[PDB]
Design a protein around this ligand. Structure first.
Ligand code: NI
Length: 109
């Protein structure tokens, strides 16, 4: 069980380009992922919830229509704006609801 980690790719993203939040060390027995704007799980800043089983991505309140969650939890943010700079928090939701979070930073220039 390696620590769940996100890595923004690239860390520094040109405005209007894309960043992929890479997800390292997804745990086993997963149900879904959730991405949040900011440094914590906060449903109000939730970008997307992703049901692994049904492969359904549901936008949360922070979804800007630019975010693509992949089945590997990685988050694609396209057409990055200057307001995208900052932290992103993945929650990995496990079937047992013993969930893990990782943050999650990139910088738009
Ligand atoms: Ni800057």
């Amino acid at each position: 069980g390696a620590q769940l980690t996100t890595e923004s790719m690239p860390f520094n993203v040109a405005e209007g380009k894309e960043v992929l939040l890479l997800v390292h060390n997804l745990p086993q027995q997963l149900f879904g992922y959730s991405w949040y704007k900011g440094e914590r799980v906060d449903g109000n800043r939730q970008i997307v919830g992703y049901a692994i089983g049904t492969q359904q991505a549901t936008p949360g309140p922070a979804n800007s229509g630019r975010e693509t969650i992949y089945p590997n939890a990685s988050l694609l943010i396209q057409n990055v704006t200057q307001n995208d700079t900052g932290f992103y928090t993945l929650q990995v939701i496990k079937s047992d609801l013993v969930n893990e979070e990782a943050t999650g930073q990139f910088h738009v220039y």
